Amino acid sequence: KPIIERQGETVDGLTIIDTSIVWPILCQCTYPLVE
Amino acid sequence: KRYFPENLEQNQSAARLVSAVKARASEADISSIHLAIAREVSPMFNVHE
Numbered sequence: 001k002p003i004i005e006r007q008g009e010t011v012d013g014l015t016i017i018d019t020s021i022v023w024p025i026l027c028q029c030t031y032p033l034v035e
Numbered sequence: 036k037r038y039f040p041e042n043l044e045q046n047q048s049a050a051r052l053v054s055a056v057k058a059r060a061s062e063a064d065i066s067s068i069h070l071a072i073a074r075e076v077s078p079m080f081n082v083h084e
Contacts, residue, residue: 007043008043008046008048009043
């Protein structure tokens with residue numbers, strides 16, 4: 001039994017990588033800079 | 036029932052292999068099991084296929 005193996009499963013739901021998450025990072029969110 | 040199991044049939048790569056084994060399944064009919072063990076030793080007169 002291999003360690004790194006696509007055992008098609010859902011940890012609810014981390015296997016599903018998603019882009020389009022980059023838009024809130026640039027135009028939505030504020031950072032502590034600019035205690 | 037436990038031969039398409041092990042968990043992880045909730046994977047959308049299995050869906051095809053899912054039904055292939057399912058449509059190849061039989062039920063544990065008490066008499067049907069005994070007929071397989073008995074046919075192994077019993078002499079025949081008709082050439083079954």
